[PDB]
Amino acid sequence: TLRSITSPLVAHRLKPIRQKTKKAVVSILDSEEVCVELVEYVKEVLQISSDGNTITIYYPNGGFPLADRPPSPTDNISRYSFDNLPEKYWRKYQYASRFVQLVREKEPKIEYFDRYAKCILMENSPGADFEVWFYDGVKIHKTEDFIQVIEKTGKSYTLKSNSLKEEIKMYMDHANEGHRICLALESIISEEERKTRSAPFFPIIIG
Amino acid sequence: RSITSPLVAHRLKPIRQKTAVVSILDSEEVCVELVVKEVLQISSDGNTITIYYPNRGFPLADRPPSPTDNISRYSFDNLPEKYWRKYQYASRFVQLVREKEPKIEYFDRYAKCILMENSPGADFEVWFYDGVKIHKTEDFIQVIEKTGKSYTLKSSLKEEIKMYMDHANEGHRICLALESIISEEERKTRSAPFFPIIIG
């Protein structure tokens, strides 16, 4: 069971992207499906559901040239659950998940303009990244692992654990309020998309 | 006061229109330059009017003349009648901006919904992805079919279009519920404003 190792990917609300590695192309489609074309001709396509829990695999007949769109499916097709997926495709599923993990860290879920900064909560929940692009060129990025400060000069620092330099704290004190605010809205609005179950309320731009 | 209510320019993006010149400043203050020779600056909340004269003077710049010492402040109530029709010009203008100024853009699978800033009872435009368009108002609803066949109903079932009108009504209910939820939170937080908002 792939489960014993990794976890199902999440691509919900991800804008489209196509990147060519050497071994193959990876995509996020308008459907928020994830496509891995193994490879210059495509010999194998994996199409993972936006949830992670479904993997569709189709081949050609013959020895599928490269393209904008991925190749429309064939009758040589299969479907697996995350649990049923054969070992053979596991490292492919993990390429797709690493990639998607990359995108979500940089995919805004909420953009909020305070008097003093642009605040960005990312899609890499739980514990998503949080960027604060101060309008006077200060930058504070918060991560589960750590916090990066960049000063108006370019002095850039990490704090995996505080006294900063006091003046840093005015900015960090703000960053924190912004995080508390974007985390309260995300909860409120998320509550609403539960109660209504209509169309996604994310991402949002505020102010 | 007896007549017009104080204007509201909260969250309105800047604009200078020439006719007198009227402006909404980056401060959400409303400026009327009469022609210059007189400047009225109404507060974003409508209740304070600052009036200053040149020391004519003031050639028509693209920005309002910086402040002078021939200056007055009034309350909405204190405002002398000499200035009432100037205030009312400013109020009509702002009513016009607000009706076309969006507070909420929501992207449904079928359409773009826009609740405007002309509360209470704000306009609600539904720009369907297929080219259908519905515009709700307190007075009436305009329907534009894909053809162009406009139809300003004022009170009715015409069939088929009811599929779209039902969607439009859902979107309104959804946008009117988000406004309430995010409005509660803004009441409880004291942070920077939460509107406008784009969702989707």
Author numbering:
A (entry chain A): 586 to 624, 631 to 654, 657 to 754, 759 to 804
B (entry chain B): 588 to 606, 609 to 624, 633 to 652, 655 to 754, 760 to 804
Give sentences from the paper.
While extensive efforts to obtain a high-resolution CPB CP structure yielded only a 3.7 Å overall resolution, the structure of CPB CP_v1 was solved at 2.64 Å. No densities for the C-terminal 32-mer extension of CPB CP_v1 were detected. An individual alignment of PB1 or PB2 of the CPB CP_v1 structure with the respective domain of CPB CP showed a Cα root-mean-square deviation value equal to 0.6970 or 0.7679 Å, respectively, well within the acceptable range of two superimposable structure models. Remarkably, CPB CP_v1 exhibited a substantially reduced level of twisting (119°), thus forming a greatly flattened PB2–PB2 axis. Since twisting of the β-sheet occurs as a cumulative outcome of an inherent property of the peptide backbone in each strand, the CP mutations near the PB2 base might have generated a long-distance effect along the PB2–PB2 axis, yielding largely disordered PB2-tip residues (see below). D707 seemed to stiffen the CPB architecture by engaging in two interlocking interactions—a salt bridge with intra-subunit H771 and the other H-bonding with inter-subunit A796—thus securing the PB2 β7–β8 of one subunit to the CPB α2 backbone of the other subunit.
Plk4 dimerizes through the cryptic polo box (CPB; residues 581–808)6,8,9 of its C-terminal domain (CTD; residues 581–970) and its N-terminal kinase domain (KD)-dependent trans-autophosphorylation activity generates a phosphodegron at S285 and S289 to induce SCF-βTrCP/Slimb-mediated ubiquitination and its own proteasomal degradation.
